[model samples]
Target: GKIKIGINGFGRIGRLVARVALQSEDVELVAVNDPFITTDYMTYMFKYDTVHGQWKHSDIKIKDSKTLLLGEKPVTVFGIRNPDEIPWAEAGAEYVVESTGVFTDKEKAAAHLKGGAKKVVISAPSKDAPMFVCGVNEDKYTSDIDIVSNASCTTNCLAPLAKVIHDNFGIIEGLMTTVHAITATQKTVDGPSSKDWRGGRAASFNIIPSSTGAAKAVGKVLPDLNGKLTGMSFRVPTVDVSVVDLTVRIEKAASYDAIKSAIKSASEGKLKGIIGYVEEDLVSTDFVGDSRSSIFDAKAGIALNDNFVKLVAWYDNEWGYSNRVIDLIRHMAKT
Candidate 1:
């Protein structure tokens, strides 16, 4: 039996999930709900992405105000004004991916259950939700857990790097700075900040410094490294892909070659398809549609003063994270 899937926020992550799900034979995209985009616009947006380029495989067509035909597959779409109003049961969805980023609270997220979804998977980090990083702590997932948070893209990149290092060298203290791409949360033009002024400024004009919860999220996955990690973020004026600049003090001494070998070995063995190691002089644009959680810059690993080390990695924040969400959905389907 094919596992029926519903999506609750048809933004960047939601639409990408649909695209990726269509490629899978084990799951069906039963329905989608988002109040903001119209059915026609949603169909168009899925056919093309400014960052991911074009949808070459699937031919997407609007069926009505609330549905679309992707190739031979028919999918139901809803522009419901309220989050609680979406009918997951009517669409026959067993699992729902909530990518709205608005309903992060556990109580609010459970509204999908009231609407008839068996499970809810949040695309963004959520409070009190069981956070899963595919390569890090996904072993904690079980059928008893209904709502799961596919932690932020930066955490996806940071956790694996931290895990591989922490397992081999053991981290003493660390700091992470993510050079992230501009997101929908930022303002397009100068405006009044409901919270932070930097976030209200035009995203295309400035390299705005902002807060990130990735450090805290990584700590959730690796609880022992809780207070030892600190993180910050800078949203650069770019369209897609992001970088993580990590510096850590290890408990033991490791040369640059040994660290690089450990990362490469992990990527090929334990991390396999999730973590990728690269040795090219590449720029951020080169990783726009990359599916790896993080691509280690093998040449960028630096060891200094015995116990200190620096590492660099890159990820396609939208594409990579969306892929993991699908993986979690499939994992839950079996449970």
Candidate 2:
């Protein structure tokens, strides 16, 4: 009756997937493969998050080394490193949200499908796997497509904004800079890390400049804007909430009202829950648990002479992306 779910990693995104899935009615989390942490630690992280707070839905504990008890519900845990080696079929996990931060390419991610999952959705951007961002090009999904990526959290925030703007006014070119939140990949203190020296700097204090493919990635989801968008990132010290600042060159002249209302219209209609419109005087911390993939800031949009525009949106990067994984899987099961 319910679609079974398996997570490849129990880090930030994976743990949140489990958190969201428990609250969802259509799916059940059956297994998770994380070789680095014990089942106890997995439950510990899930139960308590500094960004989102306590998981009070169910009392949680280790049923055994191989299993965990979320109240009465049992979830299997694995310590295997290789994808093909994990026994996902044993737990009846038809859909897998692969969040390990490794196994990002098609063949590597497909190993989960090869081993057991009927389908795989990578939590991060993939080098080769077909990518789909919900509310953008997700209508292109078909059941036969087994392994895919949900794309990046940043892409999720950008594509929806770009789609409404591009669809209404038409986009010529755009440059984006996201004031993004820190992640596990960054170093806690100044140490050896990242390709550029900026990424290796202390994540807790420095505003690190990093490059992101999200704008280019948006092209895959919305082919009309392909090669027309480019973007970069600045990783801030904040833990969960992040914002996107996009400046676009449109093919037609549009007022700020036209651009903002276009997004408002979509958010209220077809895009509904996937995109949220915010007019409240809010801060980054106010968006900590927001479930919408992109929250369009009503006051932050501006336009110039009808040809140039600037827009902003906020995302609870971890929470929003995790919930979309559930939504995408629900679509997979239905479609």
Candidate 3:
């Protein structure tokens, strides 16, 4: 039987998670909770995406103000203004994916369990919940941990790339710059600022520099690299995909070819299906709907000195990260 699942927050990640779950035979997207949009608008948003194009395969219909029909499967839609008000048990949801980005606190996230979910999976990084990066530390997952964090898109890309390098050549030191796309948190035009002025400025015009927790998050997955890795981010004008420019100092002498070979080996074996390797001339748009955590640019690997190397990896932040959420949901169900 399909595992009954509930999704909170019908934004980019939640909508894509629903899309992924509906297509899977092992999952049933039984309930959704979003305060902003109605079932009709939700259906429309799911059917059309500016970055990902259209939902060509499935027929979507709004059954009513409170329900949606994806092909023949009926799903309940709840417009609960409060996260604690979502009726997961009433909808028979075994697990709930919390994609709101608002409920990061452990005490707050536990509200899903209070609302009657067997498990709550957070879509972003959390200080409290144990982070589970599929190919990196999924083996550490246990049923006793009710709340799980899938971490952020940049961290997802960083962990596997760092893992492959750390495991083979060993990382002496590392720095990463994530060339990220504008998220919902950023403003389209100049506006008021709470603290950071860049956050309130126009996202379309400037390549805004910002701080990232991805480096710290990667440390959680690979504890050995805790104090060794540092990172920053620049939110560019791109709409969908993002790139990670990671440079590492290795313990041993290595060439650009050796680094590429290690990444290629991980892409085919250790981190197979999670990491993708590409050699052709490609842009961000080429990876819009790609499901892999990160795609290693085979041609972009550069060696500065004997022990220093720079690597480029690409990720479809929304779609790819949402796919990982679904994979975690399935893994949780099996466990």
Tens-digit lDDT string for candidate 2 (113-232): 776779899989999888888888889888899998997899988998998888888899999999988888888888887467777789999988999999999989998899999989
Off by over 4 Å in 2: none
Model 1 residue pairs with clashes: none
Model 1: CA > 4 A from native: none
Global Cα lDDT for candidate 1: 0.85
Steric clashes per prediction = 0, 2, 0
Candidate 3 C-alpha lDDT tens digits along 1-335:
68888998889988888888888778888888877888877878888888777888778777776788888888888988886778888877889999898997777888888788888899988878899888999888898889888978888888889888888889999999999999988898998768778888998999889988898778888889998898899998988889999988998787878888888988999788689899889988999899999989988767788788888989899988888888887888788
What does candidate 1's lDDT look like per residue over 71-148, in tens digits?
A: 877888888766676888887888888988889877888888878888899888888888888889888888889888
Per-model TM against the reference = 0.97, 0.97, 0.97
* Candidate-wise lDDT, in order: 0.85, 0.87, 0.86
Model 3 whole-model lDDT (C-alpha atoms)? 0.86
The residue pairs in collision within model 3 are none
Clashing residue pairs, backbone N/CA/C < 3 A, model 2: 253-306, 254-306
TM-score, prediction 3: 0.97
**Model 2 reaches what TM-score against the true structure?**
0.97
